[PDB]
Amino acid sequence: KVGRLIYTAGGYFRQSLSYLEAYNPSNGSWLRLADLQVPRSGLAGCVVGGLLYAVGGRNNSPDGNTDSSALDCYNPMTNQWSPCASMSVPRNRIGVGVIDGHIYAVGGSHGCIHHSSVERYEPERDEWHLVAPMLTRRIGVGVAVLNRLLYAVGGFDGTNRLNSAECYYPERNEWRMITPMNTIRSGAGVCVLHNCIYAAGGYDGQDQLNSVERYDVETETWTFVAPMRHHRSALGITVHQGKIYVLGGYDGHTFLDSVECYDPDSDTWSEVTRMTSGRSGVGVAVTMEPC
């Protein structure tokens, strides 16, 4: 369990960013690591086999906006990024989840297209293949995996921001709606802790949110927990040693540098550190410290 860091890749502040930085909860330190080859915001991060993957996003620059179909892998042992096979389609504001060593890329946008499509990456073959599409088009979708089922939560379908959510059952290659959230949320942070799917923050179409709700997969209910200290949309999120960490985002005024940590035992959020600069739209995941 020891020696794992929270990695934050990419993001947005004025333009899309190439930063890869890693935070050590055990000593409070931050490390700046190898930049992404292409700056991206609206990407997702995940880890398989100790390698960190950056999936999708968009490169916003003064010279334009390019939605990304890229999959790039970072090896902490070498501090190097390598390109992997690209997805079938660019996906900005994507959601990803990992089941049994396979990466699922969910939704996202390509220009004015809002995807319902979903595709699955096999690291051992370096190949993507499409799977069944969601029942709803969703960008800014939160994705998490619990008990080898994949959940897609909230987002924006091109017309309305969503409180709906759905679950993918891999052995039937089928999506089914689940109970909708109590709040409309696009760009929320979605993760799994214990037997629940948490949805933190986001934008309800009117304001950035500090509220947080969790879906108990057994009872099929959404319940609010303690709100974050800060309203945040387009936040990064991950879980580490039994606590949720939320990183950055936009509060309606500032791009936040604050990182908050949720303790489910006390139902409290605490501010634990600050990123090196404020940003939104980052990809976040946990793996071993680099060499």
Ligand X SMILES: O=C(O)C[C@H](c1ccc2c(c1)OCO2)c1ccc2ccc(OCC(=O)N[C@H]3C=CCCC3)cc2c1
The residue ranges that bind ligand X (CB under 6 A) are: 12, 41-42, 93, 140, 156, 161, 186-187, 203, 233-234, 250, 280-281
Q: Which residue from 64, 66, 62 is spatially nearest to 40, judged by alpha carbons?
A: 66
Residue 233 touches which member of ligand X, Cl ion, none, C-beta under 5-8 Å by kind = ligand X
135 exposure class (CB count in 10 Å sphere: 0-12, 13-18, 19+): middle
Identify the three-state secondary structure at position 8: strand
20, 33 in Cβ contact below 8 A? Answer: yes
Residue 280 touches which member of Cl ion, ligand X, none, C-beta under 5-8 Å by kind = ligand X
Find tokens 């700046």 and name the residue.
32
Pattern 84-103, binding to Cl ion, x per CB under 5 A? --------------x-----
| Tokens, residue 34 | 């190898």
User: Please, which residue, 235 or 290, has the CB nearer to ligand X?
Assistant: 235
Q: List the interface residues with Cl ion, window 265-284 (CB under 5 A).
A: none
User: Please, which residue, 225 or 284, has the CB nearer to ligand X?
Assistant: 284
Does 46 engage in binding with Cl ion (CB under 5 A)? yes
CB burial of 205-240 (b: ≥16 within 10 Å; e: otherwise) equals eeebbbbbbbbebeeeebeebeebebbbbbbbbbbb
Find tokens 């629940």 and name the residue.
196
User: Please, which residue, 68 or 287, has the CB nearer to ligand X?
Assistant: 68
Q: Which residue is nearest to Cl ion (CB)?
A: 46
Does 47 engage in binding with Cl ion (CB under 5 A)? yes
Find tokens 């370096």 and name the residue.
126
55/31 Cα distance (integer angstroms): 21
Find the shortest distance in angstroms from Cβ 48 to ligand X. 22
User: Please, which residue, 42 or 45, has the CB nearer to ligand X?
Assistant: 42
Site of interaction with Cl ion (CB under 5 A): 46-47, 98, 285
